Amino acid sequence: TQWDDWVDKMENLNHDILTTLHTARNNLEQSMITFNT
């Protein structure tokens, strides 16, 4: 249904954003460590 499909998209987006934020923080941490090398 229309509603189920929205739920599925929202939940997939949840996962995408979680992984994206983790990646961002990891890249930031890498740059900080390298700068202080």
Partner 1 sequence: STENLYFQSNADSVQNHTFEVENNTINGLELVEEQVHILYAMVLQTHADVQLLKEQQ
**Where on the chain is the footprint of partner 1 (CB under 8 A)?**
2-3, 6-7, 9-10, 13-14, 16-17, 20-21, 23-25, 27-28, 30-32, 34-35, 37
| Spatial separation of the C-alpha atoms in residues 37 and 19, rounded to whole Å | 27
Distance CA 17, CA 4 (A): 20
Q: How far apart are CA 16 and CA 4, in angstroms?
A: 18
